[PDB]
Structure formats: C-alpha cells, structure tokens
C-alpha cells in the first residue's frame with residue numbers, strides 16, 4: 001500500500017505498485033491488475049479542496065466513460081470510498097501506456113512515415129470526439145499517449161467542452177492555443193492544436209513558443225505573416241484588430257523554408273490546419289481526406305459517436321460541494337451494490 005512515503009490504497013485488486021511521472025492533482029503510478037493479469041496505470045486525484053480541480057475531474061470522467069474509441073484513453077475502473085464524507089482522493093484506472101509524444105520527441109527525430117501515421121491516429125480519434133460535438137481544447141504532445149508507432153491514445157479531457165459557437169462571454173496550453181481564442185467554443189481550435197503538433201513532429205520543437213499571449217501572437221504572425229483585412233475584420237474584440245496594427249509588417253514565411261526536409265503534402269496539410277481565419281481552417285473529415293493521409297484514410301474503419309454528447313447538468317457556476325456529489329454519483333457504477 002506504501003509508495004514513496006504516501007498511501008495509495010488501491011488493494012487488494014491492484015498490487016506491485018511502482019511510481020511513475022506524477023500528475024497535477026495527485027500522482028500517477030503503475031500497478032498489476034490481479035483480475036486482468038496485466039499491468040495498468042492508476043491516477044490518484046485529490047480535487048476536493050478547490051473548485052476548478054473538481055470541474056476538471058468530473059469533466060474527464062463523464063466524457064471518458066461515454067466515449068469508446070481505440071485512439072481515446074478509456075477508464076477501466078474508479079476506486080473510491082463508500083461514503084462522501086470518507087473520500088478525499090479518487091483513483092482512476094487506465095490502460096498502461098509506455099510513453100507520450102512529448103517524451104518521444106525529446107529523444108528521437110521522427111521519420112515521415114511515423115509522423116504520417118501518428119497524424120492519422122490523432123485525427124482519427126479527433127473525428128470521433130468532434131462527431132460527439134465535443135471539443136478537447138488542450139491537444140499537445142504530452143496528451144498523446146504512445147505504446148508503439150501503431151498505438152496512440154488521446155488523454156486528459158479535463159478542459160473538454162461541448163461545442164457552442166454562440167457561447168460568447170480558464171484557458172488552454174499557450175503554445176497550442178488558436179489565434180481566435182486570444183483575440184475573441186469551436187471545433188476549429190482543435191485542428192489548430194493538431195497543426196501545432198504536426199509542425200512539432202517535423203522539427204522536434206514547438207513552432208510557436210511564446211512567453212505570454214501577446215508574444216504568442218507575435219510568433220504566430222511571424223510565420224503566417226501580417227493578417228489580411230479579411231482575417232482582420234473577424235477580430236471582434238477591439239484593442240485587437242486595432243492593437244497592432246503598428247504591426248511591423250511581416251511576410252508569410254513559406255513552409256518549405258521552415259521545413260526543407262518535409263513531405264510537400266505534409267506541408268500542404270499543415271498549411272490548411274494553421275490558417276489564421278478559423279472559418280477557412282480545414283475540418284477533421286477534410287484533414288483525414290487530405291492526400292498526405294491517403295494510404296490510411298478509410299471512412300468505414302473510422303467510428304463516430306452513437307449520440308452527440310450533452311451534459312445532463314451544465315457545470316460552470318456550481319460550488320465545489322455540488323461537484324463532489326456529482327462526482328460521487330458518476331463513479332457509483334464502479335461501487336459494490338450499485339443498482340439501476
């Protein structure tokens with residue numbers, strides 16, 4: 001039960017614990033499933049002190065328990081105390097994945113073939129997510145779990161939202177953040193992130209590594225060049241479209257100059273994914289149909305959602321006590337004596 005001066009309490013089913021890269025809300029550890037005769041990953045989460053942590057925990061649980069797809073990480077089991085009073089830390093059991101794209105990029109330059117089929121697997125899972133009317137909102141290499149070159153799964157659905165183009169009023173990982181987010185809930189923001197990931201696979205480094213959001217914008221415009229009047233007019237929040245302007249005018253740096261060693265089809269697709277204007281940005285079914293992925297594209301082998309997702313209760317304004325109860329309810333199916 002003991003792991004590095006801290007209780008884990010995931011017995012007696014899960015044993016032979018071994019500490020691995022710890023998460024944010026608690027920690028992550030490997031374990032042997034005595035029931036399934038295989039090693040698994042267990043994610044200890046203690047979100048109950050703070051409201052946001054409770055949103056992200058509940059968000060990921062509802063989404064992942066409903067989703068069933070080869071390129072999306074699943075939830076095998078949830079370990080938790082019998083009563084609400086007793087539980088402070090939730091345990092989530094998932095398939096063990098050897099590494100992630102972030103780690104893999106630190107150690108290896110990727111071949112065009114490996115990049116191509118990685119890109120396919122991401123978009124395949126994304127197709128499922130978007131067909132369910134769900135946004136991931138935080139795609140990046142570290143959220144792409146890997147076992148082999150043929151085994152990629154998308155994880156961390158804490159920031160996942162149901163799509164809502166008309167939702168106008170916390171933010172995603174900066175380097176992979178779409179320009180419309182920083183200037184003024186659409187599927188286009190996910191394609192942008194993927195574009196950033198594709199660029200990163202092609203050169204083993206972030207394409208837009210800003211220090212903060214204004215600098216993030218400068219990096220983006222530094223490659224794409226100064227936005228047209230067309231793209232300018234779609235910036236609804238003044239002090240942006242009329243912030244800069246002043247705009248040390250920049251020319252569009254050609255993709256083939258940034259990535260001289262890359263497949264021209266990859267750069268073409270990369271170009272469609274990283275278009276400034278979100279309304280002109282390529283969609284997930286179109287990206288899959290792009291020539292660069294023609295050797296893998298197969299609509300008959302790309303499952304979609306049975307029913308477009310909708311949160312039965314809308315969580316944004318609810319207190320952390322109400323969240324704990326909703327978390328308690330959602331995880332009840334994994335408890336002994338569960339009815340209905």
Ligand SMILES: OC[C@H](Cc1ccccc1)Nc1ncnc2[nH]cnc12
Pocket residue numbers: 020021028030041073094095096097098099100103145
């Ligand atoms: O790099 C991601 C790590 C990789 C890893 C695997 C074994 C030992 C050390 C490191 N795996 C996971 N990390 C977080 N959550 C998960 N769910 C399934 N696998 C993982």
